[PDB]
Ligand binder design. Structure first.
Ligand SMILES: COc1ncc(-c2cc3c(c(OCCN4CCC(C(C)(C)O)CC4)c2)COC3)cc1NS(C)(=O)=O
Length: 863
């Protein structure tokens, strides 16, 4: 009653779209999606509320383990018990498990409190002080990201013993409240008229129409007659296609482009020929067209919601039968596909097939041999499914039936293979369903790693209710960190009309599954709303007065009760494990670039030093490409660490949250190379030669024996970023967008341009950095060549995972980023990783690029 109405208003506010707008569409596909997904998500919520206390820790605080640990040394730890000011500091080993640490804390408590405690270490979990992060399970302490981080920074781990009854209290508080194949005639449509068309009156209007199965044409395109430009053009003509109705695949899309000719593009529109209930569409359709920025098959199959201004195309789908017609059921397809001749070939033809399947464009005879030998592909080359799918004639229903017969007994494939199958190049729904089935084995860590790409794939989906949406919702409702990022990736695109409906519906369903998480996300949205209002003030004030004046006025605005309340006590959108407790107004400011990004600092007495965290709020720029670049850098770091190579990278958080809005994580104790190289007087870093500035700064932050470790951190991170920027073609690199941590770690910021966007970005070696690597010496081949060895090792590891980067970037094409919109952009990655070459050929090639970059660096060393 009253609670259902309040929850509806809270979802509406959170997702940025009134739920009443869904009802107003009177769309059965929307209605069925809402009902089915609410039931699915409420079932997941019921399962969650009865989880055991350890399972509930797995849901809410999923373990953050080191990449080498997934699937010796002395350490001091500080441990306290919940709600007690008193703590215990003790020595443990990096190889010890949390249970031994907890048993030690319990024996310590029993001696102090003078009682032989009933509590066993099995009744507890260790919280990282003031963070939503826990250590539990049968893992050595150094396997935990928190401990491994402390061990490298030299800091003492601070942990809280939390009893099972306290974890159960958290679970309880967080509860939700109480026949086609007989139709041989050619497919045809009637193009009736156009409405609200805007073009040059001197020209003529033409409608180009094509039938597609993904990117592939099902037959040649057909064009209407040229008619004179006017607001309401009238064609009333039949467009006939070179394909029988019986041969239309299930996922066939009819694509239109309206243009003006003397070519002047105007608009485009697509639609699925079968509806969500597998019925062949008949009757009139008014297609509200999307403005053209000619045929766009990857474009959405839903009409433009701006019906007041959009050009409209009115078409007629003829009634092909006196009764409704549905795509044949799976049982009928398999029955037809069951029949076929097994391929019989010579020992040479078997060697010919093995060659092409293990090799990826083919010639016609190569395609025919693959299709002929399809049974052998299934039985002995199952990972070559994608090749067989690409040779299948999707315009012949018998060939499709034969392919589906094999797909239905195809063995599950590795994750890497399934990622390729999510591409728009594989539009069939059974293929889509097969790909998801092979992705069910993704660990939560892998899923989190590829979540951004899986969300982009939703933009290629033809219908609202789909296996990918159910999969993501199911995984999000079983892991709070996944749920957090799924919400933000969808929410940050609500201002995009082509996805607002789909994304709004998914976010509503998720909210049905966790009323409590909806409220936690609302608190984050309230802080972002205040940051946007504050940033607008800063933008205006910065153009009228001095920075100390704008900063004092920013502080006065933040000190208002409504701002102090909204900006405090939230989970960070960048990392829900990070708690943003007390906003430190005195330390807040803004940066001097065009959009005046805000620099917001927080503190938390419960987290101690670890509670000192910062966020950058930036409004005016699209942060999606920065996020993708940083996530690709983070992936390189994981892949290197899995081979035991830690290049001390800094993949700081970057999250779009709204229209040209997002957050960026602050890396404290860091400064830009430009600021350090200003070589200011009366500073500990001041130098005789500007080349000494960076090394002098590192020496001032790392006195005595600590200097050596800082130079090594610099060398390792420099190698990681040299390789990362070269592979990704990160350009426009200068002293203002390269930073250094006091630890010595170098890192890059502000990823404006990548994939050479178009010019081939060469490998870069900067003399100032070569100088630090060489410990300030002019000649130090021992250190310089160790650094070259790190670059080579890093590069060879990435090449081995070359296909993973290609498959992920291929899926990213769905995002519509201007620097990742075609094959040329992905060709850049193929060249940088030299994937066509042997490891020896690619290493020789990299060596030539590294040596070319050294000679270029030496043009500075000569000076
Ligand atoms: C996508 O856009 C960006 N991407 C990343 C960053 C970024 C990230 C990080 C850091 C940064 O520091 C910039 C140095 N410095 C910090 C302190 C500032 C003081 C408090 C004194 O005003 C003075 C500037 C900057 C540090 O940790 C991580 C900034 C931008 N946007 S921009 C270029 O318009 O600023």
């Amino acid at each position: 009653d009253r609670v259902k109405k309040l929850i509806n208003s809270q979802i509406s506010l959170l997702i940025g779209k009134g739920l009443h707008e869904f009802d107003s569409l009177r769309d059965p596909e929307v209605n069925d999606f809402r009902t089915k997904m609410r039931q699915f998500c409420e079932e997941a919520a019921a399962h969650r509320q009865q989880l055991g206390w350890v399972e509930w820790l797995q849901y809410s605080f999923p373990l953050q383990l080191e990449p080498s640990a997934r699937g010796n040394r002395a350490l001091l730890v500080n441990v306290k018990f919940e709600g007690s000011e008193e703590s215990f500091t003790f020595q443990v080993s990096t190889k010890d498990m949390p249970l031994a640490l907890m048993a030690c804390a319990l024996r310590k408590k029993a001696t102090v409190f003078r009682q032989p405690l009933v509590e066993q270490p099995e009744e507890y979990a260790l919280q990282v002080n003031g963070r939503h992060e826990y250590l539990y399970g049968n893992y050595p302490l150094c396997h935990f990201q928190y401990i491994c981080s402390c061990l490298h920074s030299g800091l003492t781990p601070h942990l809280t013993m939390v009893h099972s009854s306290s974890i159960l209290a958290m679970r309880d508080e967080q509860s939700n409240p109480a026949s086609l194949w007989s139709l041989e005639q050619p497919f045809s449509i009637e193009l009736i008229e156009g409405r609200k068309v805007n073009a040059d009156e001197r020209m003529k209007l033409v409608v180009q129409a094509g039938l597609f199965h993904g990117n592939e044409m099902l037959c040649k395109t057909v064009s209407s007659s040229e008619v004179n430009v006017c607001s309401e053009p009238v064609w009333k003509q039949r467009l006939e296609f070179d394909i029988s109705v019986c041969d239309l695949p299930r996922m066939a899309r009819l694509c239109f482009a309206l243009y003006a000719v003397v070519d002047c593009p105007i608009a485009w529109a697509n639609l699925m020929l079968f509806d969500y209930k597998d019925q062949l569409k008949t009757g009139e359709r008014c297609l509200y067209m999307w403005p053209s920025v000619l045929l766009n098959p990857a474009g959405t199959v839903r009409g433009n919601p701006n019906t007041e201004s959009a050009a409209a195309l009115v078409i007629y789908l003829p009634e092909v039968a006196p009764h409704p017609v549905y795509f044949p059921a799976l049982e009928k397809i398999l029955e037809l596909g069951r029949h076929g001749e097994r391929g019989r070939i010579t020992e040479e033809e078997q060697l010919q097939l093995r060659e092409i399947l293990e090799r990826g464009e083919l010639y016609e005879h190569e395609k025919d041999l693959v299709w002929k030998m399809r049974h052998e592909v299934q039985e002995h080359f199952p990972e070559a499914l994608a090749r067989l799918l690409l040779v299948t004639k999707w315009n012949k229903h018998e060939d499709v039936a034969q392919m589906l017969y094999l797909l239905c007994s195809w063995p599950e494939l590795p994750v890497l293979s399934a990622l390729e199958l999510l591409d728009f190049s594989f539009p069939d729904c059974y293929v889509g369903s097969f790909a998801i089935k092979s992705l069910r084995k993704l660990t939560d860590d892998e899923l989190f790693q590829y979540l951004l790409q899986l969300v982009q794939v939703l933009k290629y989906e033809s219908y609202l209710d789909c296996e990918l949406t159910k999969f993501l919702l199911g995984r999000a409702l079983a892991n709070r960190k996944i749920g957090h990022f799924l919400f933000w990736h969808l929410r940050s695109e609500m201002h995009v009309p082509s996805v607002a409906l789909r994304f709004g519906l998914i976010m509503e369903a998720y909210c049905r599954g966790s009323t409590h998480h909806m409220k936690v996300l609302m608190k984050q949205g309230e802080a972002l709303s205040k940051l946007k209002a504050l940033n607008d003030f800063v933008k205006v004030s910065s153009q009228k007065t001095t920075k100390p004046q704008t900063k004092e006025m920013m502080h006065m605005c933040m000190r208002q009760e409504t701002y102090m309340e909204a900006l405090s006590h939230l989970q960070s959108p960048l990392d829900p494990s990070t708690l943003l407790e007390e906003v430190c107004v005195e330390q807040c400011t803004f940066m001097d670039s065009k959009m005046k990004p805000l620099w917001i600092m927080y503190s938390s007495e419960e987290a101690g030093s670890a509670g000192n965290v910062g966020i950058i709020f930036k409004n005016g720029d699209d942060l999606r490409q920065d996020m993708l670049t940083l996530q690709m850098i983070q992936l390189m770091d994981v892949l290197w660490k899995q081979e035991g190579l830690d290049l001390r990278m800094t993949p700081y958080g970057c999250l779009p949250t709204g229209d040209r809005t997002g957050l960026i994580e602050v890396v404290l104790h860091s400064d830009t190379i430009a600021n350090i190289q200003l070589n200011k007087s009366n500073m500990a870093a001041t130098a005789a030669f500007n080349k000494d500035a960076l090394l002098n700064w590192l020496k001032s932050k790392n006195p005595g024996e600590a200097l050596d470790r800082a130079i090594e951190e610099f060398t390792l991170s420099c190698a990681g970023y040299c390789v990362a920027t070269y592979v990704l073609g990160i350009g426009d690199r200068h002293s203002d967008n390269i930073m250094i941590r006091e630890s010595g770690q170098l890192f890059h910021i502000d990823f404006g341009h990548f994939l050479g966007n178009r010019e081939r970005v060469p490998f870069i070696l900067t003399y100032d950095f070569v100088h630090v690597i060489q410990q300030g010496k002019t000649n130090n081949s021992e250190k310089f060549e160790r650094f070259r060895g790190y670059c080579e090792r890093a590069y060879t590891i990435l090449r081995r995972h070359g296909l993973l980067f290609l498959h992920l970037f291929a899926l990213m094409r769905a995002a519509g980023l201007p620097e990742l919109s075609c094959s040329k952009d992905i060709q850049y990655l193929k060249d940088s990783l030299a994937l066509g070459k042997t490891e020896e050929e690619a290493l020789k090639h990299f060596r030539v690029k590294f040596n070319e970059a050294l000679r270029e660096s030496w043009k500075t060393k000569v000076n």
